[PDB]
Symmetry: C2
Subunit: 128 residues, 2 copies
């Protein structure tokens, strides 16, 4: 049936998994803000391009999705292999599992504001 | 009919008054927190330790998103851990950080919790 924020979001994650960033503006506002950085669609694209450069096998998968008319919260689970430094940790090609908890404010079916927290402690424990 | 949002704000209010005799009103007997199946008693012990470590701890939601069975909260903390906190030497410095937390509710009570705290924000403040 009729699409919901959940559908839009899972389509966004799909494009991310195929690294289809020419399509990014379908899902992300021109003036998107991420963790208070007002860096826009192109800053957001650069951020994702860098994430994949740093973690070639990165893949996005939501464990939990909660949403209403304007907002979506996702628990995303990662099982991946950062090449080098990641969150100032010398991961250095080891496979690690960690989650990200992220809130999205949508405006006109596109991500407008993002607040994200990654589980650095989970990574520390795996290296420690 | 009571929304998850109302129940959750009532829960945070009880926490802010350290009213942990009432905790079972809001938390299931078999509550699991970050994969630890430690029950209502384990959960109470966790909160009791949080307040012992951080006397000025106070719970306030900046964002709430909920449906029939789940609630996600962005909570903002401005507080003063007495000592070591997330293995950092905070040691009586006032720090600001958020927690992003998902709750599964069963019969009006918190049954499962997944929480991530912003360690990086604290690092930036000490660093």
């Amino acid at each position: 049936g009729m699409q919901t924020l959940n559908d839009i979001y899972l389509a966004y994650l799909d494009s991310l998994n195929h690294q289809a960033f020419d399509e990014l503006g379908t899902f992300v506002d021109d003036n998107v803000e991420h963790n208070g950085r007002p860096f826009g669609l192109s800053g957001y694209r650069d951020m994702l391009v860098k994430d994949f450069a740093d973690i070639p096998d990165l893949r996005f998968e939501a464990e939990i999705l909660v949403s209403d008319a304007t907002r979506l919260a996702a628990r995303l689970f990662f099982d991946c292999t950062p090449k080098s430094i990641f969150m100032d940790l010398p991961v250095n090609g080891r496979r690690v599992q960690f989650c990200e908890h992220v809130f999205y404010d949508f405006e006109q079916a596109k991500i407008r504001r993002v607040w994200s927290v990654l589980d650095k402690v989970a990574i520390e424990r795996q290296l420690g």
